[model samples]
Target chain A: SGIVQQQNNLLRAIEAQQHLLQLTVWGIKQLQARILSGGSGGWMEWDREINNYTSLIHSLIEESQNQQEKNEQELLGGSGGSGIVQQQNNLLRAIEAQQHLLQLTVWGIKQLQARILSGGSGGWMEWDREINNYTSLIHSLIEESQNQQEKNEQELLGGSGGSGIVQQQNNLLRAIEAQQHLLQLTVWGIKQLQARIL
Target chain B: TWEXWDXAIAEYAXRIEXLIXAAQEQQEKNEXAL
Candidate 1:
């Protein structure tokens, strides 16, 4: 019961951290635009906030992972059904928050790209570096999700389960598919941006 | 009964975890230049 309650709380904590992360990234962009003009201030403050949020979010996620790893025994312990269902719910919520974070990230990249396209950036070399940085990040995500999906599918085929287990594998496969789809959408969006520029 | 979803979900969970970390790290790199 205590663990179940903590899972719910930790899920929300991560969600809010992701939100603040989006705000901080966008704030950095906003500061860059202001400096692109004549006024300048708050870069240091925004820098602090980004790193601060990243550290906090990383710890929260690490805590969740600790729970996940330690509770392997709970998989077949006193409350088998309860343990599985609770973790499933929490895991779904985690994926939702992740989807939102990725959405914000891709949007930020497009926003930054638009600014660069509109002549807001004065340094072409720096812009090139930044865009390619984002490009590479998304590429890595796409590949990571792809390989994991394949791995999970193989496990599903070779394993034994009841009807409930099969249904879960189906649902999980769909969920992971949705995740990869979310990533590929960003990939296509950026690929178009690059083609337009070149 | 052996549950297929157990390790499958764990691997899936780990895969799900990667996106947010990479995004945040990349966002940091896109941080302001000193």
Candidate 2:
């Protein structure tokens, strides 16, 4: 959705500039038509001025074309400009969301692992303990996610990754461990969950 | 007396695989567009 919106905005910008170009051309055409209709004294001088103005307008059009090309290239390149920066921001948000999820998984696993190792009854007690851990972990994860979002915003302003890939990879590893822990706990949670109904 | 973590591992592994594949696709498309 974001990508599509960005593309649409770019196209609209281009169309607006193109429309302005058309208006300029039409203005020049009207000037020529007026000069042609007024066949009188000072026609030579007026023709000369029109010729000069035509040259100037031609150059203006050329410059506009160049500017448009630059804008398109900047949009497509996704670097060193507003659109690129915005896209980077969106991508960072997506990455941050993924990281938050990872953190949640990790917290879930840690709780489960602790419960198993605590020598508690390997039944509902353990499940309750793990779920309580999940609740706290979710809270922390939410807080950390907000912090990471701020960091991402700072990165945008600074115009650098700030060890983005490294940080995300580390987070993923932690998440993986957490996921493993969850599976270990799931053995108990599922059983308890089932027992509650049955 | 139960299944292993193979299914979970595979699911995560597939996610990683898809990410790689997507990154590759993006690289190729960006290169072509360039």
Q: How far in Å is the alpha carbon of A137 misplaced in model 1? A: 22
True C-alpha contacts between chains kept, each model in order: 0.00, 0.00
State the lDDT at A157 in candidate 1.
55
- Could you give candidate 1's per-residue lDDT for residues A1-198 as a string of tens digits? 233333333344344434434443544354355434423333354446446545655665665566555566574465344344435444544554455455555554555455545534454445445545545554454445445444444554544423333233234334433544444444344434444443
List ranges where model 2 is wrong by over 4 Å: A1-122, A172-187, A192-198, B1-34
TM-scores, all models, native as reference:
0.39, 0.32
Instruction: Locate the minimum summed-lDDT window of 10 residues in model 1 chain A.
Output: A161-170
Candidate 2 chain A minimal-lDDT segment of 10 residues? A1-10
> TM-score (0 to 1) for chain A, all models?
0.42, 0.33
Judge candidate 1 at residue A123 and give its lDDT: 48
Candidate 2, A49-162: lDDT as tens digits: 545544544454454444444545664455544333343334333333333333333343333334343435566466657756754554454455445545655676765544
